[model samples]
Target: MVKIRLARFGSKHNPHYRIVVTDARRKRDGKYIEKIGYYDPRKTTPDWLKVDVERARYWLSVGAQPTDTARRLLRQAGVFRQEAREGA
Candidate 1:
């Protein structure tokens, strides 16, 4: 199963995350199928991120799951439910 999750990167203590698509059995920061976006928690205002909503929706629609954090993030960005409503 493929999963959408965060891959830790950036300097120690000042971390950033890469939103990645990877196999579920892989390590937390292991090789990934694709690099979807970036998440920077360090930012004071609203955090920093860049996501490809269409690609994310496509993956999710195909049963590529997302981790808890990834799901929350995608939900907050309106990617997850937006697709759901479109189909209803």
Candidate 2:
């Protein structure tokens, strides 16, 4: 199964994450199919995420599942809004 998730970086005290598409059997920061965006927990901006919305939708359309954390980030970015627009 292919999954959309985050890979950790920045070592020690600070941490950053890259949102990537990867195989389910791979390691947390292992080789991935593609990088879609990033998340920085320390950000004070209105949104702490940066995602390629259209690509994300395309992947979802073809059945890429997001991890629990990635799901919330996508939700906040309104990446799932189109499904509701089509469904409702």
Candidate 3:
């Protein structure tokens, strides 16, 4: 199964995450199929977090299941609004 999840990076005390698509059986933070975006909690500007909304739509169209955190981030990026427009 294809899953969209966060790969942890950076060092101790501070953490960063890369949004990735990977096989479900693979190890956490292991190899991924593709990198979709990045998330940094320490960023004060909410819009500083970056994601490829169009690529995200492609993944969703292909049945990729996102982790909870990824879903929330996508929502913040206005990803679902596109879907809503299409589903209408």
Candidate 4:
């Protein structure tokens, strides 16, 4: 199955994440189909952080399952809101 998940980058002890589309059986840090957004937990404010909502929505609509953490970030970005409203 394909999933929308976080890809770890950045230096050790200092983590950064990119929301990516990849195969479920693959390594978390391995290659991915595409990078949709980013999350920086080190940010003082809400850790949900930034992402490309349109791309996220497109992926989700096409059955891309976001990891729990990534889903929270998408919720913060309001990617699902439009679907809830217009049923698009």
Please name the candidate that would achieve the greatest lDDT relative to the true structure.
4
Query: Per-residue CA lDDT of candidate 4, range 66-85, in tens?
Result: 99988987887788875355
Q: Which stretches of candidate 3 lie over 4 Å from their true place?
A: 83-88
| Residue-level lDDT tens digits of model 1 in 1-88 | 7788877767667788877788875655478878765567765787576677677777787788888888777676567766445554
Q: What TM-score, to 2 decimals, does candidate 4 have?
A: 0.77
- Evaluated at residue 72, the lDDT of candidate 1 is 73
Report, for every candidate in turn, its global Cα lDDT versus the true structure.
0.74, 0.76, 0.74, 0.79
lDDT score for candidate 1 against the true structure: 0.74
Among all windows of 10 consecutive residues in model 2, the one with the lowest summed lDDT is 79-88
lDDT string for model 3 (1-88, tens) is 7777777768787688876777774665478778876777775665556788787766766798888998887777667775445554
Cα lDDT of model 2 by residue, 8-78, tens digit: 76789778887777787465548877887677887577767888868767667769898998888777666
Q: What are the clash counts of all predictions, listed in order?
A: 0, 0, 0, 0
Candidate RMSDs in Å, in order, are 4.8, 4.5, 4.6, 4.8
Give per-residue lDDT, candidate 1, residue 86.
Answer: 57
Arranged by lDDT, best first: 4, 2, 3, 1
Q: Candidate 1: where are CA atoms >4 Å away? A: 11-14, 25-29, 83-88
Per-residue error (Å), model 1, residue 36:
1.9
